Design a protein around this ligand. Structure first.
Ligand SMILES: CC(=O)N[C@@H]1[C@@H](O)[C@H](O[C@@H]2O[C@H](CO)[C@H](O)[C@H](O[C@]3(C(=O)O)C[C@H](O)[C@@H](NC(C)=O)[C@H]([C@H](O)[C@H](O)CO)O3)[C@H]2O)[C@@H](CO)O[C@H]1O
Ligand SMILES: CC(=O)N[C@@H]1[C@@H](O)[C@H](O[C@@H]2O[C@H](CO)[C@H](O)[C@H](O[C@]3(C(=O)O)C[C@H](O)[C@@H](NC(C)=O)[C@H]([C@H](O)[C@H](O)CO)O3)[C@H]2O)[C@@H](CO)O[C@H]1O
Ligand SMILES: CC(=O)N[C@@H]1[C@@H](O)[C@H](O[C@@H]2O[C@H](CO)[C@H](O)[C@H](O[C@]3(C(=O)O)C[C@H](O)[C@@H](NC(C)=O)[C@H]([C@H](O)[C@H](O)CO)O3)[C@H]2O)[C@@H](CO)O[C@H]1O
Ligand SMILES: *[C@@H]1O[C@H](CO)[C@@H](O[C@@H]2O[C@H](CO)[C@@H](O)[C@H](O)[C@H]2NC(C)=O)[C@H](O)[C@H]1NC(C)=O
Ligand SMILES: *[C@@H]1O[C@H](CO)[C@@H](O[C@@H]2O[C@H](CO)[C@@H](O)[C@H](O)[C@H]2NC(C)=O)[C@H](O)[C@H]1NC(C)=O
Ligand SMILES: *[C@@H]1O[C@H](CO)[C@@H](O[C@@H]2O[C@H](CO)[C@@H](O)[C@H](O)[C@H]2NC(C)=O)[C@H](O)[C@H]1NC(C)=O
Ligand SMILES: *[C@@H]1O[C@H](CO)[C@@H](O)[C@H](O)[C@H]1NC(C)=O
Ligand SMILES: *[C@@H]1O[C@H](CO)[C@@H](O)[C@H](O)[C@H]1NC(C)=O
Ligand SMILES: *[C@@H]1O[C@H](CO)[C@@H](O)[C@H](O)[C@H]1NC(C)=O
Ligand SMILES: *[C@@H]1O[C@H](CO)[C@@H](O)[C@H](O)[C@H]1NC(C)=O
Ligand SMILES: *[C@@H]1O[C@H](CO)[C@@H](O)[C@H](O)[C@H]1NC(C)=O
Ligand SMILES: *[C@@H]1O[C@H](CO)[C@@H](O)[C@H](O)[C@H]1NC(C)=O
Ligand SMILES: *[C@@H]1O[C@H](CO)[C@@H](O)[C@H](O)[C@H]1NC(C)=O
Ligand SMILES: *[C@@H]1O[C@H](CO)[C@@H](O)[C@H](O)[C@H]1NC(C)=O
Ligand SMILES: *[C@@H]1O[C@H](CO)[C@@H](O)[C@H](O)[C@H]1NC(C)=O
Ligand SMILES: *[C@@H]1O[C@H](CO)[C@@H](O)[C@H](O)[C@H]1NC(C)=O
Ligand SMILES: *[C@@H]1O[C@H](CO)[C@@H](O)[C@H](O)[C@H]1NC(C)=O
Ligand SMILES: *[C@@H]1O[C@H](CO)[C@@H](O)[C@H](O)[C@H]1NC(C)=O
Lengths: 170, 316, 316, 170, 316, 170
């Protein structure tokens, strides 16, 4: 997509992540762990389901028969009708193809975008206590236990608490 | 030491198309083109009339197969392949226009013309039109001369539409097998029938001659019609060869008309019909039948157009 | 210590729809569907002809209500509900095709046919067509037999179009009240009229008989027409029952034709008209009338479609 | 929107900002002040007005009557005409709905985008003299008076001038 | 000390339009609307029939200019301005419907009707229809009375379609110059021709009278037709004024029909044709001719719509 | 475009860069040099050519004549046909105009996006060994010869190798 995260600087996805769309996979003294970010997942899901509701819709326009399958109508008027219907088919076939392609491009860019927004949120939380790896990972320069990781995930992490020790470990 | 960010994925994804690419794999996708047909006319909650052997135009004239449909009422009208508009061989002038009127009529209500006759016979029948012995179109009267070869007296009959809605009027011109058999029925000389409503002027001279045997009969009847407005009057000047309307038809309200060869079903509801049954779907498009009617998804040529509902799938 | 970045906002915004969401509030939005009608025909700067009591087809034949419209000229032609094409009861064969021709004609210019008659009367009138006493269609001549019951001599008359543009030719067939009154006017025997131009072949036999009283008269006149090309000739072989064209009509250029029941107004300009007046708008869509004509925004079913002209509104 | 600024990491807008679309709200020893960024505001306005001019356009295609409101046309040809017109209405009603939704999505993303571009411009100006709060604010580590704030807004701010003092206050 | 990032550019770029802006310059762009016409009918690999002086409807009746086209076969059928459907002056009832049938027929295959005559002449010719001396339409027979002024005996002839596909049947009604010349050819009295197939009922009375001289002749022949289904029978009851079909036409398969005034060319292939030649293009749109037929790009009003294939051009 | 790189914080393009769409122009002790980034160039080209293939397509729908240029059809049916064709022309003329505008907007944003992705890739490679100028240039604080520049372009550059010396030159 346009935001360079999914199939970009994040090399691939996690098949282990069944909990949500996006998430964190930490590593520390106490070992590895994985958890889903609700907020990002929900923002993508809601936007996508809102697309669906937009397209799953009731055309309340009724159309009647103008020709006859048992008793063919006069050939001249029959050919005008067929030509007109074929022309209309051409229009909707085009509309449906473009609609779905345009929508699919946007869906992919939107999911890519939410991944980027989450990534940048965390960068800002870990103001000077971390540095940017490049593969979608943050190398944390102070000691951050499982308790400390949950603080980052739940948006409660205090940068000024661990600053000096991480700052010095530069 | 580190905290990593990522996204979910499958080993295998669903292929979709974008502005830039064919067949990109995404985590999830959904179909936008309907292909599922229900092989039944889904008529739950709808006043439905299945005409079976009765032709739709036969409801106005009344051959035996249409005796139970002379004053029908409906939201949905179903024409069948076996349906026939006629008993005695013939056909309607401007037939498909009249069908389109009747399909959305909501059914018909019938009323007496009030025509009274003197100096002519009025009970002409045939073997084609069978109701325990010979009969004729229920709503029509085969007018004749009192006796064989006798003169048919030039006649004038009038009907004012005294009601608030247009009156569908129908009359028939009989084309006999011979030039002789025309003279036998209505007497010699070239016969002329004329018709005049405010927005209508036409004339009808017959044409005897041999047509092939239909229903065992080589005779034909032409049927004609106009819509007579409220307060307007229609006059029939005729010298013979005339099938006279006994009753006038009025339209009840609204309906939808379809042609089909599948069974009726009051267990499913649907508003999109074609001859092979019902399209029940909320999808915006359908690839089942371009001639589907009612309230349908738009017909498209594509079999399938998948819409991404998930991110791009990037496996390990 | 700090410098902050932000954006503007209102406490309350305008709701719009997006690909993803219904009713998202934005700072500002503008309407894309026009709903404002001007209840007038806006004809500023346009040669305009309001036909009033004159029917458009009456400009070619010339009943009294159309005497001031026999050679009109226009960019815009306005038909009115009260307009009538006829004085003596009758109607045009292929009437709506001819209307469509006349609506975009730019008006008409008339020219003498040059027909000269010998052995027949040529001044037949009626009480329906009133110009201080009895009269007849100005552009037509009611041809008759010299005296009552007299024979109408089989006649041939020809007109070559010597001009650079197609000539609209019109003739009428009279259908008298009785079989007797046809013989009185044009003599006995079945009468035949024929017509032949390079790309035209048709024939006309009358049909006497009683029609209801219109304008106090039970008689009818059928009117017919063809477009005679430059240098082509048209021949009228007729034995009676004939209303002869005195003049031929030629089309002036271009025009737009409308039907309306509202007043003309030379103070506003507009190019999009419907029967309730004028749509004046630069918006791409309109929800006023799907049958609007001229150069109009596209008709849509939606009442309103707001287009965001500001950022998303995020209040404190 | 896609760029995560408006209704994203900036928590809300300023109802006080009547001067432009985007702007700065500084805080220092001399007190609070607010001012609009012309360039960003103008780039959004111009792009949006260019959308409008594109859609407010003159269809120079003339259409004539093909049926009659006073004298109904023959029923068969009348039904073909109505069917055709209804089919065309369906097409334009669809086109107008999609056009406006597609355009509105883009307008919202575009305004969000300009906010982000402005935000990132300032980050780059204050190279190492400031750090990133996370709510759309820059905590400046050297003393920056009203004169100094105007230098940032007008793109004249010199980072090398105040570097060492801000660098040391890390 | 430093490493810089940038992008490519030209001093001068290609102007394109976007959602936001008119005439933004990009590095490269490509055209999406086709304007290049090939002034030739590109018929490489296609069974092609150029009718030249033969009118398409003339292939069914057989005037001299159509003698080499009576049983033609084609994927592509080309009508020419000089083409004429007739030798003896006349025209077809419902002509354009029949043309549309023949354009996509894939050509025609002819078969004997099997009509046999007794009591009438059957070899009527004319100077208009020339094959080394006087002749007549190859597929037709001008039926007459045995001698001048003699009675034409009321006659019945029948043809069953014994084949698996619809049979195109054609017959003609002759309208002679005088009322006298009708009696000379077929005897006195008003003549009547009738026709009846399962889904067909019509009648034909002639109309003698003077039409202008076409091909040096003031006479006309009307031509009529119906499509006779497999196993259905058609009966011709006629008392005179009749041009009898000798052969019946059957349609071979599929074809495409065009009108053109440019040369055929078997060196280029194309599927999109108009009267000025061929549109050969993979572009989705074309601004050459809105009436182009075959498999064409969509016609649009715009002359040009450039599609960006490069980034925005930002020169130094 | 939406990503603020092309005709944004990069002031202009390079007419000297004929090798690809995007690239690097380094400056050092050994002098100036210029080279194209294949990967970014190829990602933009492929996406754009994929647009083209999508639009250059074969409408396999055949349409036949319903009117006649040599023998005009009956005027009434002729006007219904013309009205219908004109209505269809209006639809396609609209579709083509919107398609190309929508596509052109996206092409420009996409090229802008790839430039941004490349820019951010390099920022991440030079983790703490460089700082961000603001004009689309990276001022490198350790000594980086032509050999060293090629390491950045080819994605082999090791930040931990030159860290301390660049870190101290802060
Ligand atoms: C089939 C065969 O072997 N030979 C036909 C022969 O049948 C046919 O005569 C007609 O035969 C049919 C049934 O086959 C009827 O019997 C016809 O009689 C009636 C009718 O039932 O239709 C009687 C009826 O009372 C008459 N009614 C009136 C009001 O006149 C009608 C009516 O005259 C005709 O329908 C008008 O066309 O006829 C009977 O005519 C003969 C006829 O030529 O042809 C043989 O080949
Ligand atoms: C209304 C009523 O009480 N009884 C009608 C009676 O009026 C009607 O006769 C017709 O009456 C009208 C006016 O009501 C005219 O007077 C008709 O006469 C004229 C006409 O004006 O049209 C006279 C005219 O000079 C004649 N012109 C020519 C060229 O022939 C015409 C013409 O013959 C007819 O219009 C042709 O149809 O007639 C007068 O006929 C009678 C007629 O049957 O019916 C009563 O019920
Ligand atoms: C042109 C001129 O100076 N005077 C015409 C005069 O020619 C015309 O007579 C017709 O002339 C044409 C050629 O100019 C033919 O000679 C017509 O004769 C034929 C024909 O060839 O068509 C002879 C043919 O054998 C006849 N065949 C049959 C089956 O009857 C036909 C046929 O009768 C007619 O075509 C039917 O309409 O005619 C000849 O008639 C006269 C005729 O009124 O008018 C002068 O002004
Ligand atoms: C208009 O199109 C219909 C199909 O939509 C044509 O009818 C079909 O004709 C084919 C071959 O002749 C048959 O196999 C089908 O049974 C027909 N289908 C239906 C639904 O009727 C019809 O012939 C066309 N009209 C004209 C005048 O050609
Ligand atoms: C085609 O549609 C028009 C409306 O666009 C129908 O005419 C309307 O009919 C209704 C009910 O019969 C009336 O209330 C209106 O006065 C009519 N409106 C107009 C503008 O004429 C018309 O009947 C339809 N055509 C056919 C053949 O059914
Ligand atoms: C329908 O449109 C066609 C053009 O597409 C009209 O035909 C043209 O008429 C103009 C002026 O009368 C001529 O200059 C052209 O030679 C014609 N072009 C073609 C291709 O025929 C036609 O008149 C219109 N139909 C009706 C009934 O008005
Ligand atoms: C992936 O591959 C297997 C092959 O058998 C297939 O059954 C499965 O449905 C595929 N997964 C998806 C999501 O299409
Ligand atoms: C994937 O989309 C389909 C629509 O076809 C939907 O039914 C389903 O809920 C989705 N699957 C999952 C696992 O969310
Ligand atoms: C039909 O009616 C007439 C009365 O005018 C009568 O003479 C005749 O017998 C009737 N025919 C039948 C079958 O009832
Ligand atoms: C018909 O006439 C009656 C009076 O007899 C009147 O009540 C009714 O309104 C009239 N209808 C119309 C359409 O003029
Ligand atoms: C917000 O609310 C008030 C309620 O009275 C309304 O009048 C006002 O117009 C609203 N503002 C906008 C921008 O719609
Ligand atoms: C908001 O948009 C409207 C269009 O309806 C426009 O007239 C007006 O200039 C805009 N309002 C402001 C405050 O800019
Ligand atoms: C009509 O014209 C004829 C001349 O042929 C004349 O005898 C008759 O009196 C005229 N009628 C009138 C009312 O002038
Ligand atoms: C009609 O004939 C005249 C000569 O009499 C000629 O000048 C003119 O060009 C001709 N028009 C056509 C359309 O052939
Ligand atoms: C730029 O300008 C010159 C002016 O002569 C023109 O020839 C050239 O084609 C232009 N370049 C482009 C890419 O359009
Ligand atoms: C620019 O696009 C055109 C399409 O018109 C194409 O032929 C050409 O390959 C492109 N030019 C360059 C230099 O890539
Ligand atoms: C036409 O045929 C008849 C045979 O019935 C014959 O008498 C006549 O001479 C023939 N005419 C010609 C020119 O052969
Ligand atoms: C026509 O009849 C023959 C038998 O004579 C039969 O083989 C054929 O199937 C029939 N065709 C139709 C369409 O009924």
């Amino acid at each position: 997509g346009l935001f360079g995260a999914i199939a970009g600087f994040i090399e691939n996805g996690w098949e282990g992540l069944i909990d949500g769309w996006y998430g964190f996979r930490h590593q520390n003294a106490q070992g590895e762990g994985t958890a889903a970010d609700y907020k990002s997942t929900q923002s993508a899901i809601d936007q996508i389901t809102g697309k669906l509701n937009r397209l799953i819709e009731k055309t309340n326009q009724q159309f009647e028969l103008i020709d006859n399958e048992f008793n063919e109508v006069e050939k001249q008027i029959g050919n005008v009708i067929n030509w007109t219907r074929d022309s209309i088919t051409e229009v909707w076939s085009y509309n449906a193809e473009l609609l779905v392609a345009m929508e699919n491009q946007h869906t992919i860019d939107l999911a890519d975008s939410e991944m980027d927004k989450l990534y940048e949120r965390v960068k800002r939380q870990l103001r000077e206590n971390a540095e940017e790896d490049g593969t979608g990972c943050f190398e944390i320069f102070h000691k951050c236990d499982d308790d400390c990781m949950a603080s980052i995930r739940n948006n409660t992490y205090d940068h000024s608490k661990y600053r000096e020790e991480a700052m010095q470990n530069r | 030491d580190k905290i990593c960010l990522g996204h979910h994925a499958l080993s295998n994804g669903t292929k979709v198309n974008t502005l830039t690419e064919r067949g990109v794999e995404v985590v999830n996708a959904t179909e936008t083109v309907e292909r599922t047909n229900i092989p039944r006319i889904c008529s739950k909650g709808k006043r439905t009339v299945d005409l079976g052997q009765c032709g739709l135009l036969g409801t106005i004239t009344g051959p035996p197969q249409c005796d139970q449909f002379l004053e029908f009422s409906a939201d949905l009208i179903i024409e069948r392949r076996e349906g026939s508009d006629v008993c005695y061989p013939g056909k309607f002038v401007n037939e498909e226009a009249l069908r389109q009127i009747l399909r959305e009529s909501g059914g018909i209500d019938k009323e007496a013309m009030g025509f009274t006759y003197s100096g002519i016979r009025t009970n002409g029948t045939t073997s084609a039109c069978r109701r325990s012995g010979s009969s004729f179109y229920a709503e029509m009267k085969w007018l004749l001369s009192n006796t064989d070869n006798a003169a048919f007296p030039q006649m004038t009959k009038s009907y004012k539409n005294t009601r608030k809605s247009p009156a569908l009027i129908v009359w028939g011109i009989h084309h006999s097998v011979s030039t002789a058999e025309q003279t036998k029925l209505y007497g010699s000389g070239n016969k002329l029938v004329t018709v005049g409503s405010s927005n209508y002027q036409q004339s009808f001279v017959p044409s005897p001659g041999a047509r092939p045997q239909v229903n065992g009969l080589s005779g034909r009847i032409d049927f004609h019609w106009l819509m007579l407005n409220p307060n307007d009057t229609v006059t029939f000047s005729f010298n013979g060869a005339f099938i006279a309307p006994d009753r006038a038809s009025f339209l009840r309200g609204k309906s939808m008309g379809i042609q089909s060869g599948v069974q009726v079903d009051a267990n499913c509801e649907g508003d999109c019909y074609h001859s092979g049954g019902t399209i029940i779907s909320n999808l915006p498009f359908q690839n089942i039948d371009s001639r589907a009617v009612g309230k349908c998804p738009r017909y498209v040529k594509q079999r399938s157009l998948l819409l991404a509902t998930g991110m791009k799938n990037v496996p390990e």
